[PDB]
Write a structure and sequence with these properties.
Chain C: Interacts with tubulin. Interacts with USP9X. The structure is cut from a larger assembly and holds two copies of chain A (about 425 residues), two copies of chain B (about 425 residues) and one copy of chain C (about 110 residues). Chain A has helices spanning about 10-25, 70-75, 100-105, 110-125, 140-155, 180-190, 205-210, 220-240, 250-255, 285-290, 320-335, 375-390, 395-400, 405-425; strands spanning about 5-10, 60-65, 90, 130-135, 160-165, 195-200, 265-270, 310-315, 350-355, 365-370. Chain A is of the alpha/beta class and about 425 residues long. The radius of gyration of chain A is 20 Å and the shape is globular. The relative contact order of chain A is 0.12. In chain B, helix 1 (about 10-25) packs across helix 8, helix 5 runs parallel beside helix 6 (about 175-185) and helix 10 (about 280-285) packs across helix 11 (about 315-325). Chain B has a six-stranded parallel beta sheet with strand order 3-2-1-4-5-6, sandwiched between helices. The relative contact order of chain B is 0.13. Chain B contains 15 helices and ten strands. Chain C is about 10% helix and about 25% strand. A five-stranded mixed beta sheet of chain C has the order 2-1-5-3-4, with helices on one face. The chains are: A alpha/beta (about 425), B alpha/beta (about 425), C alpha+beta (about 110). Chains in contact: A-B, A-C, A-D, B-C, B-E, C-D, C-E, D-E. Chains C and E meet through loops of C and loops of E. Bound molecules: guanosine-5'-triphosphate (GTP) (2 copies) and guanosine-5'-diphosphate (2 copies). The site of one guanosine-5'-triphosphate (GTP) has 25 residues of chain B, from helix 1, helix 5 and helix 8.
């Protein structure tokens, strides 16, 4: 099987560097080097993310889409930056304006064809394609607009292969932009109707989870990114490993989406202990479920405790008892019968790889489909209206060839999306 | 990628020489042009040894541009790029815009079309002018004017030094500034503002010195500006393009004018004291005594701030220091704006003049923003105008220079809707 | 003395609020009370900035003066707030104020 | 079986360091080290006080509750201080004011939830929980108030598991504080109605017993503490050892409490001889009962000779004849028929471990439930009234959100408690 | 955890320089700020290599604060933290509180809000003033005043040097001290008192020297004070927080004023004599000739004492030495108070000036307490007042300074109920 990553925008891009920083080491691939793999198993399934050309050069099969040179020229001028074949860099030296409209209708719409071109060169690579990974932020141009287009096109070209989306939904407390809800509401819209698996991460849900669950005092972006990339590795790549009970994107999809919206999840990693001290090793297993299922530790902003779950997928990856795994999951399902929805006898989807995260003994990625994420699109949707009402920075959109009915559309859509999700919380 | 710059008016040129100084100073390029892309968005690698500037200089009296071609830096620019009109400056808009200023413009443009070509996919022109002057108000007025048409497809961020609230110089100043605002308004992308007087306070209160030479205020803006282009167009952990600004900074087409502010302003001689915390500098940003503008947040609700940091800064430190702020409430942000905080993080710490009077910290915050505050500053400057116009005062000086009762009265009405604009976009929910 | 009150956060239906004491010697005004309430009710789910205003149990009117706070009262924290209104809180005993009930000889 | 110690306040804390200083050696557990145990028996039952994580790191399962950093930061910065998992430290950097009200209603009430949290993490450790050990002083904030709360909550969470309380009731002659009877009367109140086994120690009953029964001329606190900790080791831990006739907290409880008040005891150690000289070894056994049953040697302030006993528990721990033990106890019960209450044919509860205190040949902890302790709560209760009457330092309580009826309550309650206890002395 | 300090009035500043001296002296921090948490509750680690002061200095004449920025220690504080009002001091409350003193307060506060922020969960402000002065009585009056409102949620222990019983200085003194008492009364937590004259006795009778420079009395309080904050906020066998005090020390809301006392006051040159016993020093504490206050326990029943010990002390030694006392009866403690003995044990012994005149023992007892005794001291100081007010004496000096017949007469009535208060809480059962 296979997949082809997609680094839309700067963020989605910045993260690319971290997702590939990791993944590679979790596959023994040095900058341009080959497979130094401490083992021999980190190779029989690599294909999922690379391509064979030389014999020591397995190149990441991702796409780097962005209308701001400097960015990709920071990712390509640093560490692992020199492993991507230049063909991968689909830049847009234009003005990468922070407008969803500027990267979806006017500026991005041009650079698109020169992207799809490659997304096809990579898809028609070889063997059988599974789906595409998509990273980006719903709070900017090259991210929400142009990346949200990249998919609307992808999903017309292969409505068969899957589409996981890793979105950095606009953090609450403080937004890293001003129109944010504009660029956001507009991209979520496109999401709820193309990709079929979205993993929403919040820069501040991370800080928290990174400053209190990792006594880490100076959580640089690199970190946040690093933590995130840690989860997306547990998801995909991982399951493309052996296991007593293994799954793969689809299983994950076909066990997690009760209703076609596409629904968005909230990823959570397992061993998340501070370096030295904490290295408690309390990782027998009840310790991992202890972790994963708590409020804090959910990369999302919202707290599960604020709304039932529809599905859950503990994708563990480290030798354990299909008994102490299958078992724990249960008590968990009974101690919290309250929030776990009922019309699904077994919400949880236990998954079990074998080999764990390179240096760790036992981990377990969590992919939750809780109704709690209602209380986020609400947020976003609110911010919109409060500012849409006055058409705040709307001239930067319309003046870019947009529509007063376009914004209406998205909000509503994504706004209805909130509605539905409640239809199950009850 | 790049951003040309047109320093217009003696002042815009003095400030220019300054901002231009700080530059090489933090790029290891001696005044001889030679250093031993990155920063190419402000310097062209002409010949095979040098670093010819990436801007131009426009004054109608030679005096001031002359001094540049005397003092080291003399070697820095191209003999060509420093435009002059031996003729007369005239502290009057009209003459500088219409009558005289006209003659030079072509030639002026030519360079910003000759320098705009040589490059590689540019982003815009950082314009440097002094609102209340002759060559600075008038001229530019039509320079930016002729730009908005020749390159509507770019950024027009004009960095102005608008009229000291009580310590103005020219007798007419307002005539010249109500006129540079109305003519440039429909042409700029984002107009940065640095108040000459409100900067003195900083030199008195936050650095201590009753001996502030113009050469200092210049070192200051010369700093805040370095935080804009220089370092930003320079790689970092959270890059921010020029476009980025206007996008994340202007809510509405009016060439909106944010305010420049810097965090660490502390005098050398203090240079040894234990440095300030990420939290303190952040907080210093919300103090109306450190903002290079006599527009004390007397009520003006911020509506978007671009916190450009530089030096050793942990993104969480920021995505926390800002969080703390977002909840101080006494800092009331506009309604229609959930989050209006563009966090720009650079790497390389600031770079203080070897021995001026600037502390020299290992991190700073050049936060700029649009604040419903200027509702004031414009008001107080508009009123001025009327008083004189109300009696025609120095009107005969413009009329006789190819202007009319029109341009004045019709540029007054102009700003009028700038007093209503900056009022409506705020104060209301 | 002071005034015993049970402070709930608007839109929670889970957290049973936190009990605070309020007087002229502890808090010079509602802004000072609200300042400490931001620390004690500090959150990011039910309360945007932790605590900016205090509303009646039903959310019909917000208090602006300490003189409106009665003993054994029930209040809600808001910041918009938009009201659900979330009641909730129930149920708890009024024993936070005082135990109405006692033991009995069963 | 198991238990989870609780170091409430500074005192209760200071003592923690001594109770664990000891106990560990009585279980071969070095600072962070493991079981160096001279034997193999000091391990089959450790669980009662530790947890398995590493394999050399059996960490004490106690709680350190205190609103004064410096304290726990003295216990954590000294000897065995680095064995407690940091998670154990439930500090309250607030102003640990010396007010019962400040650590029970205003300041402590906040830090409570962050405690109960852990008291549950430790309870739900493993196997089966027996009860919790509680150390503190009834003459301060973090001690009487906040610790007296910790239990009122514990006893609502597991009204099944037991609750031994080690209280440092306010010594007579001189009070090491001023409001003492305030912080005290208020905590005893909470005790008589939650914990079901209390061992009251008196800093001056110790001095005495430590300056005349140990020619010790400079009895530092460390000592007193040390002596106390010696008794609480004989009690618990001990009985969790084999024995011809062994008991355990309950036996101790179910043989010592005739009436539900909870009743408080007065612990007494056996071999209490000065170092060099005295090392008389007159420890055949009549020598231990000689000891234990004398007036002086009762860690309590009051003297048994001043009031009958209801129950007694000689918890011996050193190879001896179930005959010379069971026998002695008798004569003792007949030479003093006077004071030993009659409606209990056999007041005494003989208990007999095997292994003795590490370096000793034969010892025997004494846990007396004598009616004599009436003459102590009297004391306390007196001090109250004499000062309550004038509301002495009452503003420090009320001003902290208290009640004029709260103080009334406690005194009465604890005051009645005096009454009852006499109902048997007669 | 910490406790800021505001030394107000020349005196409060002289005493300040002193108490501030003893500090570094026993913390190995040379006058250069550098030493080669623990004590962080009084010093901020500005980085960095330095320490700086965790306090401020307020005088309306420069003279006295000036001298600090001359003599080594010059390096210790921040050039900023030493507030001055070049204007006029005026040995009159009114002027210092109202009229002049007002102008500075804001600024003053700013530091105790700027220094109060920088820290980590503080506990309060140890205030240092000289009751009968202009800048010391008046000013503070409103400083403590503005504190009780801005931080009602903390400790306000003001360390005063109230009027020598017969050896006063200022002619008005009482006017200034009946006024600092009434205005601060409803704002302080615990007011420590050290009588200037009654300290001389100690210098004559318990150290022998008819040459006591102010610089000495300061070394003394500079000692007793070190026993309060310094060492106490410092780990030990029986720690005692600041809150602890007010709690274990004030029976009633009146900002009650205990008295400071020290045990080992013996002159160097005696320095070799066999040291005193734990029992002797303990006993020395109950002698009305060693208490830094002319309030000889002429009848005043103690109602709470905080025996702060430091050095090598066995808790039993104390919990015995005190027992012996509790039964001396001639030391009669209040009725409503069973036990009123807060035993505070520290480790590190005292630290005497290298070569002043203080013995230098290996253990001391800084016992402070509330004694029905001050019923006197206040009385005798109140009476004073009347005599003059009875004739208005220097009244025109205050009136003309924004005061009225009100503030005097109404602050007299104030203390009146302080003569009844300190009477009722005792003498009766
Ligand atoms: N910060 C700063 N402000 C300056 C400087 N030089 C002048 N100004 C201010 O800019 C205005 C002066 O403009 P002028 O120098 O009179 O005129 P000009 O704009 O150069 O053009 P002409 O009127 O034709 O000479 C006044 O408000 C000055 O306070 C300078 O070097 N730095
Ligand atoms: N112990 C001690 N007492 C002092 C010292 N300096 C002054 N005093 C006493 O404090 C009072 C003097 O206050 P002043 O110096 O007159 O005034 P001030 O309080 O500094 O403020 P202003 O009147 O405005 O100058 C007298 O009672 C002095 O005996 C000192 O260094 N140590
Ligand atoms: N986790 C994370 N968030 C990022 C990174 N970079 C930008 N962001 C977030 O992305 C949003 C801004 O959008 P941006 O990526 O600049 O948009 P674009 O570059 O124009 O497509 C803000 O909410 C940031 O917090 C990153 O490297 N990691
Ligand atoms: N045996 C003993 N008593 C102590 C110790 N520390 C304080 N005490 C006693 O505890 C009482 C004071 O309460 P304290 O522990 O300071 O209260 P808290 O710290 O505010 O909770 C006094 O009666 C002291 O004799 C100690 O280490 N051992």
């Amino acid at each position: 099987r296979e997949i082809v990553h997609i680094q839309a925008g700067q963020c989605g891009n910045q993260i690319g560097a971290k997702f590939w920083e990791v993944i590679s080491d979790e596959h023994g691939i040095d900058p341009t080097g080959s497979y130094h793999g401490d083992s021999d198993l980190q190779l029989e399934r690599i294909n999922v993310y690379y391509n064979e050309a030389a014999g020591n050069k397995y190149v990441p099969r991702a796409i780097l889409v962005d209308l701001e040179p400097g960015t990709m020229d920071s990712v390509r001028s640093g560490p692992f930056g020199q492993i991507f074949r230049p063909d991968n860099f689909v830049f847009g030296q234009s003005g990468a304006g922070n407008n969803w409209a500027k990267g979806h209708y006017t500026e991005g719409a041009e650079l698109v064809d020169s992207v799809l071109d490659v997304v096809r060169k990579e898809s028609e690579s070889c063997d059988c394609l599974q789906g595409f990974q998509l990273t980006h932020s719903l709070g900017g141009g090259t991210g929400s607009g142009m990346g949200t287009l990249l998919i609307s096109k992808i999903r017309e070209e292969y409505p068969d292969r899957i589409m996981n989306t890793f979105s950095v939904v606009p953090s609450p407390k403080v937004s890293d932009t001003v129109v944010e809800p504009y660029n956001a509401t507009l991209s979520v819209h496109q999401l709820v109707e193309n990709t079929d698996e979205t993993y929403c991460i919040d820069n501040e849900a991370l800080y928290d989870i990174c400053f209190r669950t990792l006594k880490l005092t100076t959580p640089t972006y690199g970190d946040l990114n690093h933590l995130v990339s840690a989860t997306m590795s547990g998801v995909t790549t991982c399951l493309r490993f052996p296991g007593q009970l293994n799954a793969d994107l689809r299983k994950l999809a076909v066990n997690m989406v009760p209703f076609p919206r596409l629904h968005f999840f909230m990823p959570g990693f397992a061993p998340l202990t501070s370096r030295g001290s904490q290295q408690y090793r309390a990782l027998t297993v009840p310790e991992l479920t202890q972790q994963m299922f708590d409020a804090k530790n959910m990369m999302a902003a919202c707290d599960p405790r604020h709304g039932r779950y529809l599905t859950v997928a503990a994708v563990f990856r480290g030798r354990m008892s299909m008994k102490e795994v299958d078992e724990q999951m249960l008590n968990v399902q009974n101690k919290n019968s309250s929030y776990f929805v009922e019309w699904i006898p077994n919400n949880v989807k236990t998954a079990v790889c074998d080999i764990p995260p390179r240096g760790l003994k036992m981990s377990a990625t969590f992919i939750g489909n809780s109704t709690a994420i209602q209380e986020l699109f609400k947020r976003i949707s609110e911010q919109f209206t409060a500012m849409f009402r006055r058409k705040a920075f709307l001239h930067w959109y319309t003046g870019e060839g947009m529509d007063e009915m376009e914004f209406t559309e998205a909000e509503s859509n994504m706004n209805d999306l909130v509605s539905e999700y409640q239809q199950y919380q009850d | 990628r790049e951003c040309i710059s047109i320093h217009v008016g003696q002042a815009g040129v003095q400030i220019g020489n300054a901002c231009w100084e700080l530059y090489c100073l933090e790029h290891g390029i001696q005044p001889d042009g030679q250093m031993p892309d990155s920063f190419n968005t402000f310097f062209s690698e002409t010949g095979a040894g040098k670093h010819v500037p990436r801007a131009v200089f426009v004054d109608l009296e030679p005096t001031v541009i002359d001094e540049v071609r005397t003092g080291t830096y003399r070697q820095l620019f191209h003999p060509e790029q420093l435009i002059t009109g031996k003729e007369d400056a005239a502290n009057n808009y009209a003459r500088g815009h219409y009558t005289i200023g006209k003659e030079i413009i072509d030639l002026v443009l030519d360079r910003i079309r000759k320098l705009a070509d040589q490059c590689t996919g540019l982003q815009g022109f950082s314009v440097f002018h002094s609102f209340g002057g002759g060559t600075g108000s008038g001229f530019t007025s039509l320079l930016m004017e002729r730009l908005s048409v020749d390159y509507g497809k770019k950024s027009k961020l004009e960095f102005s030094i608008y009229p000291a609230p009580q310590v103005s110089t020219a007798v007419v100043e307002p005539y010249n500034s109500i006129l540079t605002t109305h003519t440039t308004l429909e042409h700029s992308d984002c107009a940065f503002m640095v108040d000459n007087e409100a900067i003195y306070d900083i030199c008195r209160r936050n650095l201590d010195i009753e001996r502030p030479t113009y050469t200092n205020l210049n070192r200051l803006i010369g700093q805040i500006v370095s935080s804009i282009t220089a370092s930003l167009r320079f790689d970092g952990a959270l890059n921010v393009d020029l476009t980025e600004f206007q996008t994340n900074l202007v809510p509405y087409p009016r060439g909106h004018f944010p305010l420049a502010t810097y965090a660490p302003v502390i005098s050398a001689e203090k240079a040894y004291h234990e440095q300030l915390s990420v939290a303190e500098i952040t907080n210093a940003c919300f103090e109306p005594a450190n903002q290079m503008v006599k527009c004390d947040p007397r009520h003006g609700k911020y509506m978007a701030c671009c916190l450009l940091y530089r030096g050793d800064v942990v993104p969480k430190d920021v995505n926390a220091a800002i969080a703390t702020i977002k909840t101080k409430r006494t800092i009331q942000f506009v309604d229609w704006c959930p989050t209006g905080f563009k966090v720009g993080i650079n790497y390389e710490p600031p770079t203080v003049v070897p021995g001026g009077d600037l502390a020299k910290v290992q991190r700073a915050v050049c936060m700029l923003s649009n604040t419903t505050a200027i509702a004031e500053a414009w008001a107080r400057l508009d009123h001025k105008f009327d008083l004189m116009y109300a009696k025609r005062a120095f009107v005969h000086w413009y009329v006789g220079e190819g202007m009319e009762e029109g341009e004045f009265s019709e540029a007054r009405e102009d700003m009028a809707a700038l007093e209503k604009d900056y009022e409506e976009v705020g104060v209301d929910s | 003395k002071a005034k015993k009150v049970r402070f709930y956060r608007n839109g929670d239906r889970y957290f049973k609020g936190i009990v605070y004491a309020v007087s002229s010697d502890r808090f010079r005004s509602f802004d000072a009370l609200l300042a400490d309430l931001t620390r004690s009710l500090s959150d990011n789910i039910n309360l945007p900035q932790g605590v900016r205003y205090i509303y009646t149990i039903d959310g019909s009117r917000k208090i602006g003066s300490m003189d409106e706070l009665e003993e054994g009262e029930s209040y809600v924290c808001s910041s918009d707030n938009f009201f659900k209104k979330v009641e909730y809180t129930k149920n708890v005993n009024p024993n936070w104020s005082v135990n109405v009930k006692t033991s009995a000889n069963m």
